[PDB]
Design a protein around this ligand. Structure first.
Ligand code: SF4
Ligand code: SF4
Ligand code: FES
Lengths: 688, 216, 116, 121, 73, 119
């Protein structure tokens, strides 16, 4: 390369930077953190706040370091008298029209304007004129505006145009009367609309559900993971004692960059309603509060009095791996085999991890120049993943879709809508195959709605044939990806949480269980929980599954426990407890260990480390937290192995490949109890 | 025993020019050149005696603390007769986490100096009871608060904390409210120590700015 | 009482000293400095010092150790009565029981500064 | 192609939907989301004033609702909350264009209400 | 009150005069009277009509200060 | 022959010499005997039997000394001995092979959601 790293001088120190880097990036590589208001790493460069002004030799004016490219042998000075005078003057211009609002503003304590004024500004003002006053704007139930505090950095406009894709904000007026918003009364309709509150450096845009409730210095922050979908976005939970006050994203470039959907950000208020805090046993009066010994004894009596073939265990969408392996080992120790998952396709073969995970990974998908989506709506399954797909679209990656046509906030080519179109694509009838055959690194993304189908094996065989013909998987590149929408599904597939052959046969001839264990399940089908059965519900919210149960055992939510979750790319991540257990609830694996002791066959582990070691004994990649293995690819041997499942239950070429998520804002028991999600739905209903 | 009342008139001066110049400028180099094996590091900083000057800080090993202090007490140019205090500072990031600090005052020439020794939790520091008589209670307090053992002390016992108190409260890993609390029991008819429970737990406010430059 | 001058009674560095209450209610920089000085406080630069005052019982001194934060890293308090009470073993030798209270009274001791 | 989504056919649980905290007119549109914390939930208190006031005592919100909006000439008004600026709040500059007696503008510090007949209306 | 005299029955417009805080009383100064002003009366400490917090046994309805709602079937 | 100068057994001998005066002064004649007290103090010593550093041994002996003079000078009374020395030993040797078949895990489960802190 022709010296792809160039050398600059920052305060007489030599710094090597990549080519095309700005002056601000050279200052950052020298260990200097230049003040800024309009620059962002994820947005396009604007250059309008004038706070990043530094001095370059042989230039008589201050340059804007965010926008100015760095040339070879450049000499940058960041601490001369003109730089300090520039910083103080620009701060003084920023503060003359700002309202004296720090007591009533929610950014007070974590404000860029306050801290930068304290450090790089003066201590006085000389301004005694009247200020500019601006009326506030309505942008929906999630974003609160006090527009007198706007400093015209246009981060919101650039975000709405570039990442969210909706492009609904603009600057109206001219000069001092420039004004941010929508000209007409509109609602911010993006699923990623809470991120702009983080992007605003001031209290012009604040979070409406959070408003006036806390200051940032009072909050104990815990780094956890998000379980509202299958991506597992990295988050920080802020709590005051026993109460969670807000949820924010945190940086992870391999998973979520810096974003978080509105469901994962705003569903925390469902943790304050309908909570199970006591064990209950159903008596002649109904469910009534009982001791833990009594509730464990009743559950053990019902689990032991029934035959082993009349017991079924259903895992919920939010069950961690430790509780799932505990329930699996407890039910298998009694001679049962009927295991089911609330997220569907419980009879799916889980032999090779590459067949139900994203082999390209999330960050490795950016090296693809052509993407074919099969039967998925990524905007409602994972809006952060869809934002990364839009980022790929903006720098040249072409997108095609086989499925039901949906709004994706980027242009795509609709190849078809049914498996007949998939077969026509594999044969060669559609010209998109020649586009895939000439692509350097093609990618195929299969959504969870395909795997929920009754004919999923034939569709997966067609997808495998298409990948074989189009060079999707070859030497040096694996472009085959299967994504999920539930937090607990991949861990259950990893550990082997699946029904036995005898249990599948008994379901085929129509045997009905008498005892059902509901491990956090509230979206079960009626075929799996018969009426008149004995129901043991273990969970944290009182919902459909708890209103029907005979024994209720209160567990922990994901803000109260440290459980393992695996996302759809195969990465093992963990929650952390941000608040203690509520009431008389317990840890979720501990309930099953105590219940195995009361039944009469103890589980061989007595600690959290020991049940994690049992998980690592089943599949060794469980021990490597915050990392992803490279899964083995067995070419067409796996598809040859399951041809009996392709011959039975044949293909349905007329049923469209759709997405199963029909309610984005309410997908589980926590989001169904959230009043903010209900207001979000009501806002979209009252606009018609 | 110095600074006897000698002038019967009002004095409008502090020190002499030559000795004040020597103390405020040359004392660090003088101590380093005369006794080099005693000194391992020196800092000349913002002057314990006054806001207008500079004064030295001497770092030494525990093996030579007593000869250095005897030299600083008895040498004709450094007559540091008064030991004001002995204390410690905890630095949990270091291999030797404690810095034992000695402040001295010279009534002869209106000077002050600071002497430091770095040790960990299990290295004894020689006592200065024979050199300075106040070193007794200060070393007892330093042992009480930090757990620094002073070898050769006549009676090293705790002086400040409770009678059965194990634990050294001024360490960074010791909790502010501790582990035990105290109440009267009507059944046992005695004042009894119990594990800690708080009606309102302490609220920790994390105020620190992510733009602040001074944090070290 | 005779040489009391007219002028400022507080240092005009607004990044250390809080502003006046009329100034805080009328200028943006004063309100920002009022907000920050009453929550985070000023940051003291990293360093150390020992400073002493001729207190009415003797030399009262503070050894302040700064790492750079808005909180003291270590604050040792030197009290004169602590050193004066250490002398009671050598001062009361050869005296009688009715002179112990005279010795304690003439050392001028207060146990708040002795027992920190 | 790209069929419209019917939001009106989306189910919402009736326990959740009837418990949304909303606002009266005041400083917002009437009926938008009202921020709440967990205090008072164990005692079944959904109201702001009832969380700290007990009885039929006159609330502060009922005190400020009895003071009529004030007619101000101009386009911007400065609110101190007192005749003496030292004794009130930090000065608040409130926009007055688009305001009338029926839809006045409210100070975020004091709750006083202002309007102007000067914006060509 | 000759039998139970108490300084808590002094109104605040006489309190600063009698405590030598200012030289103002109603006989020479017209105080501004707020519409919410509660008149001064004798203290109620030692009796059962004293002030008590809202979680107290002597309240009309004691509070459980839980910050969440429990599920009732 | 005996590791680190045999200082553990010398200190144990010193405490055992000091013990009957403790029993008389604290009036523990009808509560515990000298044999069980010697066994208890011996059990305090075995907890640090795997210390590999002589300076830690010297510090532990110095701290144990200061504990024994704060017991000698009546700065901790008989109820302190009860609540800190002999009942923890009797609790560690009384709960062994209990009359119930519950594991320690299940007792902890039925007690509270979290482990106990302190004694
Ligand atoms: S944005 Fe809010 S907190 Fe920040 S300076 Fe302005 S009023 Fe104060
Ligand atoms: S609302 Fe916030 S992000 Fe948008 S222009 Fe104003 S200050 Fe910038
Ligand atoms: S950060 Fe460069 S001008 Fe704003």
């Amino acid at each position: 390369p022709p010296s792809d790293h160039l050398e600059v001088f920052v305060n007489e120190q030599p710094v090597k930077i990549p080519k095309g880097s700005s002056v601000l990036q050279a200052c950052d590589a020298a260990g200097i953190d230049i003040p800024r208001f309009c620059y962002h790493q994820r947005l396009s460069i604007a250059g309008n706040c004038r706070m990043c002004l530094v001095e370059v030799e042989k230039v008589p004016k201050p340059v804007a370091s965010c926008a100015m490219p760095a040339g070879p042998g450049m000499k940058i000075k960041t601490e001369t008298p003109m730089v300090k005078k520039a910083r103080e003057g620009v701060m003084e211009f920023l503060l003359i029209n700002h309202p004296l609002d720090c007591p009533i503003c929610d950014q007070g304590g974590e404000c860029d304007l306050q801290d930068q004024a304290m450090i790089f500004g003066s201590d006085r003002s000389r301004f005694v004129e009247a200020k500019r006053a601006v009326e506030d704007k309505n942008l929906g139930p999630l974003v609160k505006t006090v527009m007198t505090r706007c400093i015209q950095c246009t981060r919101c406009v650039r975000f709405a145009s570039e990442v969210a894709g909706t492009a609904e904000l603009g600057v109206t007026g001219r000069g001092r009367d420039s004004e941010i918003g929508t000209y007409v009364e509109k609602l911010m309709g993006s699923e990623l609309s809470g991120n702009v509150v983080d992007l605003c450096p001031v209290g012009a845009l604040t979070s409406k559900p959070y408003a006036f409730t806390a200051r940032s210095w009072e909050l104990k922050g815990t780094e956890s993971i998000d379980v509202s979908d299958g991506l597992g976005a990295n988050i920080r939970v802020d709590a005051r004692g026993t109460e969670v006050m807000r949820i924010l994203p945190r940086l992870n470039e391999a998973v979520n960059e810096e974003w978080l959907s509105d469901k994962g950000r705003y569903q925390y208020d469902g943790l304050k309603h309908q909570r199970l805090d006591k064990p209950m046993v159903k008596g002649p009066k109904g469910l009534q509060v009982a001791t833990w010994q009594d509730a464990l004894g009743a559950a053990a009596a019902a689990l032991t009095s029934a035959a082993p073939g009349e017991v079924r265990g259903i895992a919920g969408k939010l069950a961690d791996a430790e509780s799932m392996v505990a329930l699996m080992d407890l039910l298998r120790g009694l001679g049962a085999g009927d295991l089911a998952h609330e997220g569907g396709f419980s009879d799916m073969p889980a032999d090779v991890r590459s067949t139900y995970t994203a082999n390209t990974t999330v960050q490795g998908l950016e090296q693809s120049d052509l993407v074919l989506l099969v039967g998925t709506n990524p905007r409602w399954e994972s809006p952060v993943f869809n934002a990364r797909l839009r980022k790929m679209f903006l720098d040249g990656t072409q997108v095609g879709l086989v499925g039901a046509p949906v709004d994706l906030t980027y242009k795509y080519e609709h190849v078809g809508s049914d498996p007949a179109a998939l077969a026509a694509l594999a044969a060669g009838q559609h010209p998109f195959l020649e586009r895939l055959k000439k692509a350097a690194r093609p990618a195929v993304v299969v959504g969870p709605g395909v795997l929920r189908r009754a004919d999923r094996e034939a569709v997966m065989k067609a997808v495998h044939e298409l990948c074989g013909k189009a060079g999707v998987v070859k030497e040096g590149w694996n472009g085959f990806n299967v994504i999920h929408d539930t937090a607990s599904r991949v861990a259950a597939l990893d550990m082997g949480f699946g029904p036995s052959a005898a249990a599948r046969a008994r379901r085929a001839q129509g045997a009905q269980p008498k005892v059902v264990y509901l491990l956090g399940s509230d979206d079960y089908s009626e075929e799996d929980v018969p009426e008149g059965a004995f129901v043991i519900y273990q969970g944290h919210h009182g919902d459909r599954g708890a209103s029907r149960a005979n024994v209720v055992l209160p567990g922990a939510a994901y803000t109260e426990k440290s459980g393992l979750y695996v996302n759809f790319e195969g990465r093992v991540q963990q929650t952390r407890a941000a608040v203690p257990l509520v009431g008389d609830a317990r840890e979720d694996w501990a309930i099953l260990r105590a219940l195995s002791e009361v039944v009469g066959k103890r589980l061989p582990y007595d600690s959290h480390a020991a049940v994690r070691a049992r998980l690592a004994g089943i599949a060794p990649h469980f021990a490597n937290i915050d990392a992803v293995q490279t899964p083995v690819w067995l070419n067409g041997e796996y598809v040859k192995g399951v041809e009996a499942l392709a011959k039975a239950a044949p293909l349905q070429p007329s049923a469209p490949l759709t997405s199963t998520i029909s309610n984005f804002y309410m997908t589980d028991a926590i989001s169904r109890a959230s009043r903010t999600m209900a207001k979000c739905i009501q806002a979209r209903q009252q606009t018609k | 025993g110095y600074a006897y009342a000698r002038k019967t008139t009002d004095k409008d001066y502090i020190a002499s020019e030559h000795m004040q110049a020597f103390g405020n400028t040359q004392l660090t180099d003088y101590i380093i050149k005369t006794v080099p094996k005693f000194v391992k590091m020196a800092v000349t900083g913002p002057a314990q005696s006054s806001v207008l000057y500079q004064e030295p800080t001497i770092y030494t090993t525990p093996e030579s603390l007593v000869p250095l202090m005897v030299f600083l007490r008895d040498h004709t140019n450094t007559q540091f007769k008064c030991l004001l205090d002995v204390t410690a500072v905890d630095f949990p990031e270091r291999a030797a986490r404690f810095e034992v600090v000695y402040h001295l005052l010279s009534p002869r020439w209106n000077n002050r100096i600071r002497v430091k020794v770095c040790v960990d939790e299990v290295t004894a520091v020689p006592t200065l009871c024979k050199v300075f008589n106040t070193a007794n209670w200060f070393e007892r307090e330093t042992w009480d608060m930090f757990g620094v053992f002073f070898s050769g002390h006549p009676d090293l016992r705790r002086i400040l904390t409770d009678y059965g108190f194990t634990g050294h409260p001024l360490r960074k890993d010791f909790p502010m409210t501790g582990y035990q609390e105290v109440r009267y029991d009507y059944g046992k008819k005695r004042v009894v120590s119990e594990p800690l429970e708080l009606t309102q737990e302490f609220r920790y406010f994390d105020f620190n700015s992510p733009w602040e430059t001074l944090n070290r | 009482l005779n040489e009391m001058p007219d002028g400022l009674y507080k240092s005009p560095d607004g990044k250390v000293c809080p502003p006046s209450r009329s100034t805080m209610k009328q200028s943006m920089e004063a309100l920002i400095h009022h907000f920050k000085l009453y929550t985070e406080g000023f940051h003291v630069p990293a360093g150390e010092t020992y400073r002493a005052v001729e207190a009415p019982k003797g030399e009262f001194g503070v050894y302040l150790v700064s790492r750079g934060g808005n909180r003291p890293y270590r604050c040792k308090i030197r009290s004169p009565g602590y050193a004066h009470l250490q002398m009671t073993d050598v001062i009361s030798r050869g005296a009688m029981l009715a002179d112990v209270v005279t010795i304690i009274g003439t050392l001028d001791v207060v146990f708040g500064e002795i027992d920190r | 192609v790209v069929p419209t989504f019917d939001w009106k056919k989306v189910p919402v649980p009736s326990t959740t939907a009837k418990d949304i905290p909303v606002t009266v007119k005041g400083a917002t549109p009437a009926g938008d989301l009202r921020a709440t914390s967990g205090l008072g939930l164990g005692d079944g208190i959904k109201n702001h004033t009832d969380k700290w006031l007990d009885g039929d005592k006159k609330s502060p919100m009922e005190y400020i609702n009895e003071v009529a909006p004030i007619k101000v000439k101009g386009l911007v008004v400065a609110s101190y909350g007192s005749d003496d600026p030292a004794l009130g709040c930090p000065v608040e500059y409130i926009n007055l264009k688009g305001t009338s007696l029926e839809n006045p503008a409210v100070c975020k510090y004091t709750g006083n209400r202002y309007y102007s007949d000067d914006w060509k209306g | 009150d000759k039998f139970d005299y108490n300084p808590t029955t002094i109104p605040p417009e006489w309190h600063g005069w009698l405590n030598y805080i200012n030289d103002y009383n109603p006989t020479n100064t017209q105080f501004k009277q707020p519409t919410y002003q509660i008149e001064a009366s004798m203290t109620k400490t030692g009796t059962q009509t004293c002030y008590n917090p809202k979680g107290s046994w002597f309240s009309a309805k004691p509070r459980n200060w839980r910050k969440y709602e429990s599920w009732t079937p | 022959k005996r590791l680190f100068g045999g200082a553990a057994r010398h200190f144990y001998f010193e405490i055992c010499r000091c013990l009957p005066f403790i029993q008389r002064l604290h009036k523990m004649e009808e509560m515990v005997s000298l044999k069980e007290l010697r066994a208890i103090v011996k059990e305090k010593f075995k907890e640090y039997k795997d210390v590999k550093d002589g300076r830690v041994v010297d510090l532990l002996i110095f701290k144990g000394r200061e504990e024994i003079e704060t017991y000698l000078l009546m700065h901790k009374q008989r109820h302190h001995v009860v609540t800190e020395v002999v009942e923890p030993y009797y609790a560690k040797q009384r709960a062994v092979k209990k009359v119930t078949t519950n594991s320690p895990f299940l007792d902890s489960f039925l007690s509270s959601g979290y482990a106990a802190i302190g004694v």
